[PDB]
Design an enzyme around this catalytic site. Structure first.
Site, PDB file in Angstrom:
ATOM      1  CE1 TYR A 508      41.084  35.960  44.272  1.00 37.07           C
ATOM      2  CE2 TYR A 508      41.250  38.480  44.380  1.00 37.07           C
ATOM      3  CZ  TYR A 508      40.702  37.402  43.955  1.00 37.07           C
ATOM      4  OH  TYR A 508      39.387  37.423  43.693  1.00 37.07           O
ATOM      5  CB  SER A 591      39.879  33.766  42.022  1.00 35.81           C
ATOM      6  OG  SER A 591      39.187  34.682  41.618  1.00 35.81           O
ATOM      7  CE1 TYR A 592      44.813  39.363  38.527  1.00 34.21           C
ATOM      8  CE2 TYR A 592      42.792  40.200  37.625  1.00 34.21           C
ATOM      9  CZ  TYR A 592      43.941  40.118  37.675  1.00 34.21           C
ATOM     10  OH  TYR A 592      44.774  41.417  37.038  1.00 34.21           O
ATOM     11  CG  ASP A 669      32.862  27.865  38.389  1.00 35.72           C
ATOM     12  OD1 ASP A 669      32.152  28.801  38.846  1.00 35.72           O
ATOM     13  OD2 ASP A 669      34.085  27.681  38.782  1.00 35.72           O
ATOM     14  CG  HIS A 701      34.809  30.167  41.621  1.00 32.83           C
ATOM     15  ND1 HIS A 701      34.805  31.464  42.314  1.00 32.83           N
ATOM     16  CD2 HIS A 701      35.686  30.208  40.894  1.00 32.83           C
ATOM     17  CE1 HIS A 701      36.180  31.918  41.810  1.00 32.83           C
ATOM     18  NE2 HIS A 701      36.692  31.258  40.933  1.00 32.83           N
TER      19      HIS A 701
END
Ligand SMILES: *[C@@H]1O[C@H](CO)[C@@H](O[C@@H]2O[C@H](CO)[C@@H](O)[C@H](O)[C@H]2NC(C)=O)[C@H](O)[C@H]1NC(C)=O
Ligand SMILES: *[C@@H]1O[C@H](CO)[C@@H](O[C@@H]2O[C@H](CO)[C@@H](O)[C@H](O)[C@H]2NC(C)=O)[C@H](O)[C@H]1NC(C)=O
Ligand SMILES: *[C@@H]1O[C@H](CO)[C@@H](O[C@@H]2O[C@H](CO)[C@@H](O)[C@H](O)[C@H]2NC(C)=O)[C@H](O)[C@H]1NC(C)=O
Ligand SMILES: *[C@@H]1O[C@H](CO)[C@@H](O)[C@H](O)[C@H]1NC(C)=O
Ligand SMILES: *[C@@H]1O[C@H](CO)[C@@H](O)[C@H](O)[C@H]1NC(C)=O
Ligand SMILES: *[C@@H]1O[C@H](CO)[C@@H](O)[C@H](O)[C@H]1NC(C)=O
Ligand SMILES: *[C@@H]1O[C@H](CO)[C@@H](O)[C@H](O)[C@H]1NC(C)=O
Ligand SMILES: *[C@@H]1O[C@H](CO)[C@@H](O)[C@H](O)[C@H]1NC(C)=O
Ligand SMILES: *[C@@H]1O[C@H](CO)[C@@H](O)[C@H](O)[C@H]1NC(C)=O
Ligand SMILES: *[C@@H]1O[C@H](CO)[C@@H](O)[C@H](O)[C@H]1NC(C)=O
Lengths: 725, 207, 725
Positions: A508, A591-592, A669, A701
């Site tokens: 992450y 995600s990130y 999304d 998402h």
């Protein structure tokens, strides 16, 4: 024996039991057994049926959720639940009178209601319908309209818009009740000038023309919404006259530019604590803010403002923290950063600028859970020096030197990650455990710190999982030039350091992210380690929280530089261990984490062989303003534009010729739009890189619909097994 | 008793197809007033044609006034087989009548219509596949069957209307097409006056 | 020796030379060497110069195209070319005198103009700018305006909207010039109520918010654009009065419902021949209209209407064919279907319902190329009974039993597919060949069918190809229960009948489509056969169009039934042959090879190992009305709703578990929208079928961008190589 399989994971063959209770008084909580709502006396454990499973008396609608009136003479019944965003939704409600026996059919709550809440004391209801606030003094009686300015996607009265719900408030409720329920404080939002995002939501199969979804979405550097704060006196409501909402204006330190509202809190029955923040998220001002009986207005003095600043980084972990006021309201407790950078607890007074540190050390206080007249209860990662663990402590407010840990030694080799739920007046508390072992719920007494009983020890799962071949879990640290950074490895069953294993580096790497914690999980990594004999590791480098503001703020204004390099160095030091196969190393994220995977894979390091980027971020100018402008600043030439352009995935598209890349994204999304993958694909095409893609139509998402949730992980499992052969 | 002539210039004139047929009974008339009120562009009364019809006595008098552009005077002249004389209007030469044309300046109280209109194609589609197209000519003095789609007037040139005629009408779809001449700067009126002799009911007489 | 590599294909290493010429007069044409427009004399070929290479006319603006005036005194130069659809674009035009040598700088053509054309004789320009039509009687003279009622995306004056341009006309120009140029005839289309299709255009890395593209697109069964036809007299244009147009209404047999306008053709200088289509494309009326000098209008008589019915299917191969009038204008030659069901030329009189067929047989004429006073030239597939071969014949108008083949014995071994370009007055003609050998262009004299010279022999490419291993090609037939069905196979080099070869089966299977013909090609199949040693077979099943109206009209109202089973039976027949490996068989096609591929894979036959569907059609209610309603009727419960719902790819998704699927689609597709592939992918996720997918950002139906065209074939050639081990 057998192993954890994709069938066991995607069908939830092995489940974790949870004792979700709900306190209503000093000594009683409500637990939902088979379908009955029970009431448990906390001192002895005897139970009684609060409401038998008459929920089929309606029989026309399945009850999604319920909410008992705080006094206990009513209950709300959700149905027709429809999800909008992560926290937003709509539902239809019914009120069931728990006193006579009868369900109320007089002046029912509208069908397309957005939010509903009970007054903390009494049986008063405030709900939001069509972005407007209505208050029901009695469930039988009709409702009084408060706000008349609500509009769809323009003005949000009492609820948050997309950006505030997602980042700032992390909730859909933007109305707060006074401790007695006398006042109703709410926030109004204005999205008139905020630009809209547009994507195609197609339908189920039977729609000829796809529809377009337009959401007011401010991107990095674009116009933000505008907020206003109001407080209403609900006792003086009448049907003949419209209500009067008294606005509390932001402090002069905020009105000069663009600002955020980041917290609301009621100190006394007449004293609010508004907490404001600026678009340049370095500076926040709290407004201890009172009410005049004679004037009826909320004059809100300047000698009671408390300024928090941050030279190195941004204020707060994700936001400024919340004050835990003393009963009289002339003092409060709050978690702020010290001179050494670590976050600890300040004793403030409303009329003094200084705070006194009642806690100090090379650790942090994750939260203040309960505050009594004699003790303060908080969750800390002090024990054993591990940021992964979270235990419970208390301090004597009279003598700050007396610190007692209520959960360090309860079950040391099984529980190291605790959460606590406190009864009203903090008489009993339930210690939730999720640490290096099966979860464990226990009920305790605050008077003497004695364990009353074990609510749920998960004994059936401990018998089912002795037939499965289950992975281990390692948690340790590696030193980077002076500092210890913590990693975790989910080792395969019957692990042997003599042999080499593959390695999938779950990432992450978000700012203030804990990834090498102590929690027990049953997820795709359990599959990989158990069945495929893969090592699934995670690492916490620079930018990760709960180890101080020197580590957390190291990535300030430089998102995508230290996160990536620490992950690459972590992978190198993993590979230089005796049990990692140098050739087969991968990395993935949602995600990130997807951003970091893409920027690590297209960096030319040569460490990795393969990679999956689910819903990744490509540019920071495509993402929302609140999240990106907290860590990167505005994308203007004078402040920060070199790094809004110089750290993008598509600027590294020529280094993807050395890796196998899978790019997944859901086509509807709201959070991380499909654009951010649709342009990674275009940049990869324009340079001549072969990559594998996949789109999940109408998915969002968090791809989590059962069919899509199974498809995503079977696809990713096939891709990983192909990469590792 | 007098033959009221105010009605001819009353309000907005209709189109050529949707004429207002007119009748006088037992009254007194003065055609010279109409001649003086309206500047006459052309005068081609046929048959009896005593240079006017203002001195003879009759059982009744008929007026078939419509608003028509002076450009198309030839189609309504006798012995024509144009669209006007086929689907819009044909003069009834079987009985005593004649033709009158005039135009109207701003000095008059008349109101101009939106535009001049006339019917171009009025057909009967029959047969499987609706293939045979059999034009419906109109007998003299009768309204066209295609009038009722747009009685007041046609919106734009090239309007495709349709209706299914009943077994009484002959069956088959009825397709009507109208044509719109762009409105002239000055208004114009066309009159077709029919006179009928009464063998024993000769009442209408000049003043 | 070498082979044909993917580099040799994506980079055009082996390039076929063309000889494109423009007949400006009865004996001269304009070729274009290095950059020089050279005027050639057909009889002698001595090539004087027309315009030297010194093209600095605008000094920097690259000249995209030119258009010499018919008299030869002006040249039109286009630049700033921006493409919209397959046939649509906007550019900027500057004129350049050849009588003088001065570029025209006064009264210029505006920058963003849609279509510009010259008169047939003389120097007049008509151009469409902002959906409006202008006329320039002199190039250096101010324009005249004809239409004032043009609006973007609603009303098109002189240009076609999406649906007419794509299907009804196959051109962006809806303005037609009289043989003088005295009248100009144009069509007006009205898209007020046709529903729009919306998709996203990201359009750059710099564009922060993706754009939404909204196109008026009638899907099957929706509202459909209207048509109005006008004719304007150009010889009477003045500035003091805005131009007047004379409208021509459709025959009343078309006015009872919805109709199209499928053809416009000028017979005499005062007689235009309009030809309409009923929305149920079983009926069609051709209308000869005569300009009336006295009336000033255009009288379309009833006794001259020529109605064409098709009881067993639609009328026309794709639309009703155009007349080929005689000089007097009192008769014409048109290709209509005879009683046996074969499309032949039949000689019509203007005022007589009957016509007299002048050709007959078990073959079809493709077009009437030129009509001389004493002869008529046409292209037929009569020669040797090969539907996949075209040749040129002449038939004497005095005696219909005297037919000569002008292109049968020129070079039988190398040319069997012909196309002719005829000079004005038909005194010379160029024979463009693309048969089994390399293309070969020659010039012939029409006086006595002499062969003048070989314009382009393609001799350099022959020597280049003598050093690479090139595939063969076999064109034979198989019999299906009585009939003859033709197939083709791209046989690998050194093809051995004893060895087993993988089979890839290229599909279009569109109605009235020839996929097994004699044309020479250098494409992806050449790569497959040459390097990968893959047989690439194409089959003509039922629905193919040059074999009769009993084969082509068999799929009337039955799309996805015989088109799909014929390919499976063809694959079974190929497997019966010794050289095909039955385990490795694959299928693929572009959108209707895509529809058929999806339907074949989701059928449980078990013949095919894997398939690639590129831009496939999913459901026939997602597609435009002109195409789908031609072959299937209206999607109403009365007409054909049952087979509209029974012919979907989605309802075949459970049989996709035995197949490997690659689904490719461009996200900016305007013809076959991304909705098709989105709904396929949703239907295969909802049931648990694993497949591979790939989207191309900003790409239309014919993925053609050099980077994307190179990427898609490199991706597909990897999927195929993985399938075939
Ligand atoms: C294009 O078509 C539209 C609709 O077919 C026409 O708009 C109509 O105009 C009439 C004229 O009064 C109105 O009564 C209708 O309500 C309109 N329909 C709409 C707006 O949907 C329009 O006039 C046409 N344009 C032309 C012929 O130039
Ligand atoms: C020809 O007719 C057109 C009708 O559109 C005239 O253009 C309009 O003129 C009026 C003035 O009466 C303007 O208000 C409109 O804006 C004009 N239309 C457009 C699209 O601009 C035009 O003026 C007429 N030509 C002549 C010479 O009278
Ligand atoms: C083709 O062009 C010639 C002149 O170049 C036209 O000849 C005149 O056409 C008009 C009709 O528009 C007639 O009224 C004249 O009598 C013709 N002769 C003259 C003016 O000398 C010819 O008609 C054109 N062809 C058409 C319009 O079909
Ligand atoms: C909500 O909708 C239902 C129909 O599903 C209707 O019966 C009911 O009366 C509605 N309730 C309100 C408060 O409008
Ligand atoms: C909301 O914003 C608009 C424009 O920014 C402004 O005109 C309006 O006064 C604001 N407040 C509202 C609508 O209550
Ligand atoms: C931009 O380029 C590199 C990487 O792209 C970065 O390390 C460098 O510091 C940046 N320089 C400037 C002047 O922005
Ligand atoms: C070709 O030669 C002839 C005479 O033989 C001449 O009249 C003609 O103009 C020449 N063609 C060109 C294009 O110069
Ligand atoms: C045009 O001029 C001559 C033609 O023989 C030759 O140099 C070439 O084809 C052209 N020149 C340039 C610079 O393109
Ligand atoms: C086209 O645009 C260019 C640049 O804006 C300008 O110089 C030129 O005059 C324009 N031409 C026309 C015909 O509008
Ligand atoms: C064409 O189709 C229509 C409707 O399906 C049908 O009524 C008609 O008989 C068919 N054939 C012809 C020649 O119109």
């Amino acid at each position: 024996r057998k192993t954890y399989t994709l069938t066991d994971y995607l069908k939830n063959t092995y489940r974790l039991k949870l004792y979700s209770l709900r306190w209503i008084s000093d000594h009683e909580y409500l637990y939902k057994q088979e379908n009955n709502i029970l009431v448990f006396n906390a001192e002895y454990g005897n139970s009684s049926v609060f409401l038998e499973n008459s929920t089929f008396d309606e029989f026309g609608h399945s009850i999604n959720d319920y909410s008992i009136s705080p006094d206990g003479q009513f209950i709300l019944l959700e149905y027709n639940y429809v999800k909008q965003w992560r926290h937003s939704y709509t539902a239809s409600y019914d009120i069931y009178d728990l006193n006579k026996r009868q369900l109320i059919t007089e002046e029912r709550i509208p069908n397309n209601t957005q939010w509903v809440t009970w007054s903390p004391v009494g049986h008063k209801l405030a709900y939001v319908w069509n972005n407007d606030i209505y208050v029901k003094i009695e469930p039988n009686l009709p409702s009084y309209r408060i706000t008349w300015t609500g509009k769809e996607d323009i003005i949000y009265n009492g609820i948050t818009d997309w950006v505030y719900e997602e980042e700032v408030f992390s909730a859909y409720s933007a109305l707060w009740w006074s401790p007695n329920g006398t006042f109703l404080a709410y926030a109004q939002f204005n999205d008139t000038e905020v630009p809209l995002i547009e994507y195609s939501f197609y339908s189920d199969e039977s729609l000829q023309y796809p529809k377009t979804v337009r959401v007011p979405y401010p991107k990095a550097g674009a116009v933000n919404p505008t907020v206003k704060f109001f407080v209403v006196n609900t006792d003086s409501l009448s049907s003949v006259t419209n209500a009067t909402s008294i606005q509390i204006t932001a402090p002069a330190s905020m009105l000069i530019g663009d600002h955020y509202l980041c917290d609301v809190t009621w100190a006394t029955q007449e004293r609010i604590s508004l907490q404001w923040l600026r678009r340049i998220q370095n500076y926040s001002v709290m407004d201890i803010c009172d009410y005049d009986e004679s004037s009826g207005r909320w004059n809100c003095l300047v000698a009671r403002q408390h300024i928090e600043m941050s030279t190195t980084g941004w204020v707060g972990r994700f936001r400024p923290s919340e004050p835990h006021f003393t009963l009289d309201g002339n003092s409060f407790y709050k978690i702020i950063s010290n001179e050494e950078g670590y976050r600890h607890i300040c004793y403030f007074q409303i009329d003094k600028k200084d705070c006194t540190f009642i806690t100090k050390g090379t650790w942090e206080v994750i939260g203040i859970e309960a505050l009594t007249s004699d003790y303060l209860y908080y969750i800390s990662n002090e024990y054993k020096g591990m940021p992964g663990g979270r235990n419970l402590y208390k301090i004597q407010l009279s003598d700050y030197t007396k610190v007692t840990c209520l959960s360090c030694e309860l079950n040391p080799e099984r529980c190291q990650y605790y959460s606590v739920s406190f009864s009203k007046e903090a008489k009993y508390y339930q210690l939730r455990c999720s640490g290096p072992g099966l979860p464990l719920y226990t009920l305790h007494s605050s008077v003497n710190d004695k364990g009353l009983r074990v609510l749920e020890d998960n004994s059936a799962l401990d018998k089912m999982l002795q037939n499965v071949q289950m992975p281990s879990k390692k948690l340790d640290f590696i030193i980077l030039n002076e500092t210890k950074f913590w990693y975790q490895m989910i080792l395969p069953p019957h692990f042997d350091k003599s042999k080499k294993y593959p390695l999938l580096l779950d990432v992450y790497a978000g700012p203030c992210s804990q990834k090498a914690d102590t929690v027990f999980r049953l997820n795709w990594a359990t599959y990989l380690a158990s069945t495929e004999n893969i090592i699934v590791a995670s690492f916490d480098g620079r930018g990760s929280g709960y180890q101080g503001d020197k580590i957390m703020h190291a990535i300030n204004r430089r998102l995508g530089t230290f996160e990536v390099e620490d992950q690459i160095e972590a992978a190198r030091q993993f590979s230089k261990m005796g049990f990692v196969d140098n050739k087969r190393i991968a990395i993935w994220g949602w995600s990130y984490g997807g951003y970091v995977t893409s920027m690590v894979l297209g960096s030319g390091s040569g460490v990795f062989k393969c990679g999956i980027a689910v819903a990744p971020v490509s540019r920071w100018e495509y993402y929302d303003s609140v999240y990106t402008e907290r860590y990167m600043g505005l994308p203007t030439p004078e402040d920060n534009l070199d790094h809004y352009r110089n750290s993008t995935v598509m600027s590294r598209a020529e280094n993807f010729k050395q890796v196998e890349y899978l790019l997944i994204h859901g086509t509807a999304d709201d959070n991380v739009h499909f654009q951010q993958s649709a342009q990674i694909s275009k940049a990869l095409v324009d340079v001549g890189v072969d990559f594998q893609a996949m789109w999940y139509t109408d998915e969002d998402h968090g791809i989590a619909s059962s069919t899509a949730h199974q498809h995503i992980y079977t696809h990713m499992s096939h891709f990983i097994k192909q990469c590792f052969s | 008793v007098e033959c009221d002539f105010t009605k001819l210039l009353s309000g907005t004139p209709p189109q050529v197809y949707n004429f207002n047929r007119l009748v006088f009974t037992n009254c007194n008339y003065n055609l010279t007033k109409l001649l003086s009120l309206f500047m006459v562009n052309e005068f081609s009364c046929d048959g009896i044609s005593p240079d006017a019809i203002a001195r003879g006595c009759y059982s009744s008098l008929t007026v078939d006034y419509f608003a028509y552009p002076l450009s198309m005077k030839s189609y309504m002249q006798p012995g024509s087989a144009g669209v006007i004389s086929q689907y819009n209007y044909k003069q009834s030469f079987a009985n005593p009548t004649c033709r009158i044309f005039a135009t109207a300046p701003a000095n008059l109280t008349i109101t101009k219509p939106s535009s001049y209109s006339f019917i171009s194609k009025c057909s009967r589609l029959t047969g499987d596949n609706s293939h045979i197209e059999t034009p419906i000519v109109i007998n003299p003095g009768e309204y066209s069957i295609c009038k009722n789609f747009a009685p007041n007037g046609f919106s734009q040139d090239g309007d495709y209307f349709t209706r299914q005629l009943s077994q009484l009408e002959g069956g088959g779809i009825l397709v009507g097409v109208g044509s719109v001449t762009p409105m002239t700067d000055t208004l114009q009126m066309g009159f077709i006056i029919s006179v009928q002799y009464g063998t024993d009911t000769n009442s209408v007489c000049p003043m």
